[PDB]
C-alpha cells in the first residue's frame, strides 16, 4: 500500500530520473521546485541548448515566485545543454545576483555546486535569494552520456 516505499521516499526518494537542478529559496518566500530534463532528448538533441527554465513572478515562468515588485515576470532563466554541465541565464529588469556578485543579464554562466542567486537588489529589505541544488545522479549519467553497450 505504498507504506514501505513511503519510508524510502521520505528518508531519501529516488532522485535523478531526469532531474537537472533544484531551486530552493533560503530567504523563505518561494516554495521549493524541481527542474528536470530528459536525458534521451539531451543526448539525441545535438543542438546548442536542450531545455531552459524561466523563473519569475510570471505564471508562465517555469518558476512562479510569490509577488515581488522588484522582481520581473521572468526574473531569471536557467539553460541545460552544451555537453555535461549547466548554465545560468539572468533575465531580470533589475538584475540577477550570484552570491552578492551581480552578473551580466541574459548572459550564460558556468554552474556552481549549491550555487545561489540573489534578486531584487536596490533595497536591503527588497532582496530575495535562491539556492540551486544540482543532482549528482544527473552529473553521473551525463558523464557517460551514451553507453557503449557491448553487443
Amino acid at each position: 500500500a505504498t507504506q514501505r516505499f513511503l519510508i524510502e521516499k521520505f528518508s531519501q526518494e529516488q532522485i535523478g530520473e531526469n532531474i537537472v537542478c533544484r531551486v530552493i529559496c533560503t530567504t523563505g518566500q518561494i516554495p521549493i521546485r524541481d527542474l528536470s530534463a530528459d536525458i534521451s532528448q539531451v543526448l539525441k538533441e545535438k543542438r546548442s541548448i536542450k531545455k531552459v527554465w524561466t523563473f519569475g513572478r510570471n505564471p508562465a515562468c517555469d518558476y512562479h515566485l510569490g509577488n515581488i515588485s522588484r522582481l520581473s515576470n521572468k526574473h531569471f532563466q536557467i539553460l541545460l545543454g552544451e555537453d555535461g554541465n549547466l548554465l545560468l541565464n539572468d533575465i531580470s529588469t533589475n538584475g540577477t545576483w550570484l552570491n552578492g556578485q551581480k552578473v551580466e543579464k541574459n548572459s550564460n554562466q558556468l554552474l556552481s555546486q549549491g550555487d545561489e542567486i540573489t534578486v531584487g537588489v536596490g533595497v536591503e529589505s527588497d532582496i530575495l535569494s535562491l539556492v540551486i541544488f544540482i543532482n549528482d545522479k544527473f552529473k553521473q549519467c551525463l558523464e557517460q552520456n551514451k553507453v557503449d553497450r557491448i553487443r
Binding site: 515588485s69 522588484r70 520581473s72 531580470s92 529588469t93 533589475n94 536596490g122
Partner: peptide, 13 residues
C-alpha cells in the same frame, strides 16, 4: 495601469 517591473534608475550601478 500597466505592470512594468519596478526597476531602479541608478545607471545600473
Amino acid at each position: 495601469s500597466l505592470e512594468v517591473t519596478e526597476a531602479d534608475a541608478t545607471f545600473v550601478q
